Symmetry: D2
Subunit: 397 residues, 4 copies
């Protein structure tokens, strides 16, 4: 099996990397098999994961060994998630991580400011299509000096001592990086409103200055958000908490503005999904039925407005439902029912057996931590989609 072959061939530089492999790689290889990646792509991705991702993941938190840096990405504080993006026809595997520098969570690096850019630099000599210009732009806008980072750690819980995180889409035989920047540490430290920081950083992008359509989309977005998020410097949800970009040509990159809120009823779902009455068309409304049916059939909620250069009109967001604390057997039964509702008969018939087989060390009918998030979207061109985000480590124990 590819994960086993690579272990045999490569070994491990240190014990932390060995443990990360022993607790994630079998699962990943299972995911890639189940999403119908060829064997050559299984090897591609697993070898990549070994060489580039294992060293970025830092120490493997476990009984008796408490890392200086604790991630918010998972229940046990491990900076890793594996996610699937499901259509009608295909499923795509993705990794989400924080790349942990070797002084992270200590005075020389209080918010783990460097690990993600170091990974991306390695990715840029590895991969011909990786572009760091949007990364560098937002790092310059929302990054903090060391003194500022220290101040931020006094005002945030241990699981939120971070500015950046990274995802890698394993798609089209390639690795496609995306990054997300948190606005919160900068908001806190400079006592600037999150709304102003977020849009100030966006409006200084080189692509913003060249693309009139993007400027039109953002002004619509701004007009929707301005009345709904704080005008002052509080961290009072609903709030503009992350900015997302693809690490590709800035003209092709999607710009992502993520709201976080703890409150989500039907009125709020409607309001977010339709941008307050702005989107009334039949595609948007079909999406909204889907989201409402999902809520019925079933950490902050997330609303992610994604914009692309050359497009003047906003689309409906992706909405993220937190699943931490809900039984994983129930979630699986709920998703099967939702998949039948969508007419995704093949996804419905396989979901629960393939979930078991991803996570053989665990009884999903007893766990509550393995599904962490679910995102749903509807695109005008691409159709409906579902993202399921798993705490791999929780599922491997």
């Amino acid at each position: 099996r590819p994960w086993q072959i690579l272990s045999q061939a490569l070994g491990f530089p240190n014990y932390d990397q060995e443990l990360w492999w022993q607790n994630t790689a079998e699962t990943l290889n299972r995911v890639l098999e189940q999403c119908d990646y060829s064997v050559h792509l299984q090897y591609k991705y697993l070898a990549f994961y070994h060489k580039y991702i294992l060293p970025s993941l830092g120490p493997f938190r476990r009984p008796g060994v408490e890392p200086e840096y604790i991630s918010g990405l998972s229940h046990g504080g491990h900076p890793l998630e594996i996610s699937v993006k499901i259509d009608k026809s295909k499923t795509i595997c993705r990794l989400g991580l924080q790349a942990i520098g070797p002084l992270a969570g200590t005075a020389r690096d209080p918010l783990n400011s460097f690990g993600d850019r170091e990974l991306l630099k390695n990715l840029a000599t590895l991969l011909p299509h990786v572009d760091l210009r949007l990364f560098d732009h937002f790092n310059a806008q929302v990054g903090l000096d060391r003194a500022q980072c220290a101040v931020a750690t006094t005002k945030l819980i241990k699981e939120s001592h971070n500015i950046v995180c990274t995802s890698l889409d394993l798609k089209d035989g390639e690795v496609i990086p995306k990054v997300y920047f948190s606005t919160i540490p900068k908001g806190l430290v400079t006592e600037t409103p999150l709304f102003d920081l977020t849009f100030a950083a966006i409006e200084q992008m080189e692509v913003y200055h060249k693309d009139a359509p993007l400027r039109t989309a953002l002004s619509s977005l701004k007009d929707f958000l301005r009345p709904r998020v704080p005008t002052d410097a509080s961290i009072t949800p609903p709030l503009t908490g992350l900015i997302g970009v693809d690490c590709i040509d800035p003209m092709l990159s999607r710009l992502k503005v993520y709201l976080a809120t703890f409150r989500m009823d039907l009125s709020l779902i409607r309001d977010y999904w339709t941008l307050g009455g702005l989107l009334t068309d039949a595609g948007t409304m079909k999406g909204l039925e889907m989201v409402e049916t999902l809520a019925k059939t079933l950490l902050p909620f997330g609303i992610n407005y994604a914009m692309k250069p050359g497009t003047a009109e906003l689309a409906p967001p992706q909405i993220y439902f937190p699943l931490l604390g809900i039984n994983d057997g129930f979630i699986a039964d709920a998703l099967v029912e939702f998949f039948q509702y969508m007419g995704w008969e093949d996804q419905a018939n396989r979901y629960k057996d393939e979930l078991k087989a991803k996570f053989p060390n665990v009884d999903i009918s007893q766990t509550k931590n393995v599904h962490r998030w679910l995102g749903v979207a509807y695109s005008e061109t691409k159709g409906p989609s579902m993202n399921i985000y798993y705490d791999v480590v929780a599922g491997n124990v």
Copy 2:
């Protein structure tokens, strides 16, 4: 001696680092001694150099071993310079380099786009006051993807396959990084005028949006440069070829706009120094006599560097850089002694030649023409006159 002691204590991870040390570290230790750094600071800076700078310098170009990446920083293609900044009261040592990545000058990294940021990342965990925000800003504005980098190499000579370089001021017991970004590769690849892209990148700075004084200074600078540099996309002089920042809090960083030109007579020196008649005050005019006297007392382009700081609205006179490559180093030393006497820097005059000899003991500096590379001169209202001398250390040692 410190450079010897660190060799014995540290050794070398590879032969290229050993050769770098053997061709630069004696000289550097000499310079620090001559600028009256304490012994503890000599160790501090030499140990730092060994740990952080040696691995960043790449292969040591020499007969039989042609690196894939050739730097424009020195005559022999070595990515290193050492410079001294001389006042009346003190002398400061500084290093200039390019941090060479391990695939530099090959298809995976045609313009050496990553080494400098990697060095700076290491400097940020080392040093409590290092800030990368201006670095990242300009890297986003003037940097290029791989395909663009490959295009750029087809339009530039081998010595100009670069976007960034780094300097380290060894001052106040600290290491203070500065970086410089070339506008040329982006100008060439996007077929944009250098003036436009330089100012477009500056005007998108976070500090530009917060600081009215800086905007005002740049607006005056723009009015002066717009008529004097190309409005088209040519690389002809005078041109806006580099943008410089300090890797510190953006509010305290100096923003530097560097012109390169090959033509420099007395009228041009006047025009640059006074910003075309804009500066007429007595401090400016004293600076101008000094610079005129230097030009009289004495290939690469001339440089003119306008340096602007947040919170200051008015432009100051630039620093002017005289190129010295190809002029005998014994002559340059005699000229500098005379200039130092003119300034009333009697102590600097009396020591300059003997210290020059002692900086470069393994080569007869009176026979060479490549060791002094540049000379910069400035006058500040608050600081007084200054001189920067930039040496091709490797040419002084091989």
Copy 3:
């Protein structure tokens, strides 16, 4: 293809490693395909080669870039060879290299004394069955301090500034290391006879002291060699120039004593093969016919006497014929004829097309450097074998 997939997944830490891959890995993957290794084993070996062997190979000598260390292993000074061991039924791929330290061929490391042990140390945490005790034993016996190493470089050509080299058999899904130690630098520097050094080092082995059979074999070997090699300190072939061991349990390791000579006529072949009349049995004589037929159908010659603990009697040696300077098209036609002589019809029918396909950048009917060595052996239990050693780099240009 696996070599391509790994390139894509892994990239390269530096340009030298990239060039080594671009000039050897396609060939290796071709060899492994032709010897019928499964795809999973192709990935195993190619991933291993990338992680462990590429960094050990040092700079890639090429026009404009002259390394400080020049290896004798190949025509262009590259420290690599790939070899095949051919039976009737199977073919085994092996790598031979010198692991180049980062100060090799300079004053801090004049004979490249450290790179091979550093590779083996990495192999010992990678592989459960690797044993370093025989390595360390012979390193202690024939290794030299820095001053001695400097003296040795003044008395040897640049291509002989070495004490150790390494081979890796790619067999049974495993990597099996072997090492060879040169007696010459120590002989030269201490003005000790090679015969005395070689046997002194052997007789101080822990296994020699425990195994009466081995002591009996070596005393027979000593009685054969003593009259035929110098009693003085000259490097006058025939001479005892290398000692070989397997990096496994000392009780299972074969101990190999290699003679080098520039003179090889029928009388000498006979004398070496039969240990001077000592071996007269029908197995030995069939071997000898085979070797004689090979010579007829077609750097020093090599004679390698291999002994194993628990066996009191000597076996016939392996004899190594240097092929440098003989046309590679001719060698292929000669080997095809020899394979027919042996009744290895399948090996005969495939040898020349598979040779072409290993080395697609080159016209074998014009080159003289690609076959470097041929070894032949006959074992009482295992049967006849042939080892062919290729200059991979010469074959890739």
Copy 4:
């Protein structure tokens, strides 16, 4: 100060190295100052420590972070000791460590079999006089394959999962390595008596075969030890538990055979020191009074170390090591002052307590019982009396 200056210049690759430095480097710099090393040598040894020793020390065991490998070298499981060797005329500083590989104490490396040789390889390219031949010889004789290593861990406590450790004498402006190999894991796994395997490994040395004097010394040693240590495979005292060599030319290396025992009265001290009546001369007998006086003036085993050199046929008296773990460090200091007065080392007596305090400023050394770990004493005919004091640096700093 040098330890501060190197921190500022070098920083740390990871937090474990930072913590090591923060808990040992001040103390080390203190020791070097107190032994009258020049400032240049302080830098030399501190820079060396940073580059070569910090990464070899592994994780820094502390509350909340339990490393996979736990060393027996110190009370807190930290693989480091600092020791001073005191004469009448000088004091020499030495480091003892285990070089912790990155899979140590796990299935891929159960007895930490590789870190020490990796450090020594780095030392061989650093230092012109380092020689690995004796290291490799004993590693071949007493080392174990992985399966054997896993068996050994089932028969030994966690603090004894080791085969090798390393010491570095900081002497003559140089670093001189020594290594020690434990015979215990091989004794246990092969069910061989410790006496037999110790001498079997020694007798296969290349130098043993060339040097009649060394063979004669060992033959006398064997006659003395054979009746006193087990003839069976038990780990009971007295036992031959370590073999020591210098990593230098085998002809100049001292070969050290160390006994460990828990029982030490005046008759036993006499028996060990005189090799059972074998040594009766006036130098030996003066040494013996000294050692008797030390025992009177004052848990781990006692150590007795017989040290033999090629070209010497006759045995000398051993060095005897008194274990001090569990005895108050204020008391030990008062005892040593008294012993120093007895020796007529008035200067050593007058400074010992104040320097002890200043070596360990972040802990009150009068309250601790773990800081002095061992005391060794020797007498040479050619060299005079000596004392080695071994400190648990980490226990003195945390």
